[PDB]
Scaffold this active site. Structure first.
Site, PDB file in Angstrom:
ATOM      1  N   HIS A  41       0.857  -1.221   0.000  1.00 26.75           N
ATOM      2  CA  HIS A  41       0.000   0.000   0.000  1.00 26.75           C
ATOM      3  C   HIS A  41       0.885   1.261   0.000  1.00 26.75           C
ATOM      4  CE1 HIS A  41      -0.292  -0.176   4.652  1.00 26.75           C
ATOM      5  NE2 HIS A  41       0.212   1.038   4.388  1.00 26.75           N
ATOM      6  N   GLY A 143       3.207   5.654  10.486  1.00 26.27           N
ATOM      7  CA  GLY A 143       4.592   5.248  10.169  1.00 26.27           C
ATOM      8  C   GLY A 143       5.015   3.976  10.898  1.00 26.27           C
ATOM      9  N   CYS A 145       3.386   1.092  10.208  1.00 28.48           N
ATOM     10  CA  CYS A 145       3.257   0.115   9.086  1.00 28.48           C
ATOM     11  C   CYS A 145       4.602  -0.494   8.725  1.00 28.48           C
ATOM     12  CB  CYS A 145       2.769   0.734   7.794  1.00 28.48           C
ATOM     13  SG  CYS A 145       1.078   1.324   7.917  1.00 28.48           S
TER      14      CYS A 145
END
EC number: 3.4.19.12
Lengths: 301, 4, 301, 4
Positions: A41, A143, A145
């Site tokens: 993503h 952040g 992820c």
């Protein structure tokens, strides 16, 4: 004696964490050998996330769209591909700190350590469980992820989780390192309900064994039960049904304490029906379900 | 959902 | 969104941990530069621990009585001395993995990460608080002695705790890395009461701020209080008195949420007087006191 | 106390 939620020491994972930027998206990557795993993503605009065609979006990207940074060093990307919902960036250098490792899918109710990272930088380590409904009750900031979950198995870092996203309840969803989602989640902006978040019965039983091992015994009663009759009460309270295989994995703790699994099941049945009467077990006012039988065995000798 |  | 107890990543401490043996006592040591810090009780027999004269016992020891092992490598001990209750072994090699570090005494109610080690081998990492009464509610098994507590301060590992012993309640006592005990404890077999274990009020207030930041607001009321009148209720419930300096350190969170410290104090006053009515805050049925204001600021942006 |  003392009982605590504990993460695996993180050093071996710290030396695998990197920054990945694509346009104005920065998140974390896992650099093992010469491959950088991160969530796919990362390649999307906010507009793309409404109905992403990831194959089409990734084809439009080239190597130089991907800025990898390992410390203040910038890694050269010589290849970009997709396995399920994880981007793999191939890079010109093999990670010197690459530990001995393996990729494992965990079962609902299994536990693992999260090394929470921000901009490729390790921030924190915590222990959690894969919920029955395949969500993580994680601590993740923007952040976070690409932060990974793992167990250490003898010498071998077993990677089992990568964080992808947060659902409207603040629970976290992600993939194994083969890029398949835990649970029915998709990496796009569409309505996505988690199932009912049930209690991990086999983990509560382990924890009550922990409590006995550590001299908390007040909830022990003289009663007994069948696995069928226990599960009748469990179902009523949003507890996962106990299986013969659950009884099996509890065997070691049954042996160490001398309390038959179904006797411990009878104690839990009574706590569920009657509550704690303002008493605590191992310092908790609630029944804890984030310790596996192996977790308790590991910590309790 | 919320990413990042 | 999600809120979790988190330890500092441990990698920098993992590469400092060693085995120390003396006679049939094996425990953990911290190898920084060419010095190995461990508890001095390593030199004692069970008979010595009844009335140890550590100066006399250590003089009777020579370098070769101390077996240090860093992995499967054996370190050469070229000197043995004492600073307070910590043995310092000087060794012929400077630790290649020696990080940037510092030795700090923490205040009652401050938090730190424990890297729990067994036979010089990192086993687990957990976050805890120095209790008001200077005990640690730790998870320590036999051979956990010499395990260290730390914070990471920018680049700098701040060592603040070494584990020495367990009291009859299963709580843990230890020293700073200058070998002075936290609290009134002595490294010998004599009766040693911890004080009353009070709740760390300033930490509960931080955690209630955490709860607000994460959308748990139910306990917010319209009431207010003075610092004197709050402390009247606090005293009654075994809560530590709140000081102007506590209010000061809460300032950042007061600012971020817009809730004055004494308003949050009024909310806590009411929870103490009335309980939770079977409701939870950030998933807990009890008020949590192991998060400092800095801990919450750190995690919550 | 208990050491170790």
């Amino acid at each position: 004696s003392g009982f605590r939620k504990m993460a695996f020491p993180s050093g071996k994972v710290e030396g695998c964490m990197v920054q990945v930027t694509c346009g104005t998206t920065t998140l974390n990557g896992l650099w093992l050998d010469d491959v950088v795993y991160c969530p796919r993503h990362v390649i999307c605009t906010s507009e793309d996330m409404l109905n992403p065609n990831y194959e089409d979006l990734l084809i439009r990207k080239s190597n130089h769209n991907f800025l990898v940074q390992a410390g203040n060093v910038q890694l050269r990307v010589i290849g970009h591909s997709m396995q399920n919902c994880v981007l793999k960036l191939k890079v010109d250098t093999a990670n010197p700190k690459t530990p001995k490792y393996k990729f494992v899918r965990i079962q609902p109710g299994q536990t693992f350590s999260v090394l929470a990272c921000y901009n490729g930088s390790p921030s924190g380590v915590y222990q959690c469980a894969m919920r029955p409904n395949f969500t993580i009750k994680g601590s993740f900031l923007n952040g976070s992820c690409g932060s990974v979950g793992f167990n250490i198995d003898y010498d071998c870092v077993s990677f089992c989780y990568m964080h992808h996203m947060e659902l409207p309840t603040g629970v976290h969803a992600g993939t194994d390192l083969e890029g398949n989602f835990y649970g029915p989640f998709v990496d796009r902006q569409t309505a996505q309900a988690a199932g009912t978040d049930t209690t991990i019965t086999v983990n509560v039983l382990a924890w009550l064994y922990a409590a006995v091992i550590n001299g908390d015994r007040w909830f022990l009663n003289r009663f007994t039960t069948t696995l069928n009759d226990f599960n009748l009460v469990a179902m009523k309270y949003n507890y996962e049904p106990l299986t013969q295989d659950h009884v099996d994995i509890l065997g070691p703790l049954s042996a160490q304490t001398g309390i038959a699994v179904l006797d411990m099941c009878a104690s839990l049945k009574e706590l569920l029906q009657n509550g704690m009467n303002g008493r605590t077990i191992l310092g908790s006012a609630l029944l804890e379900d984030e310790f596996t039988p192996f977790d308790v065995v590991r910590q309790c000798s | 959902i919320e990413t990042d």
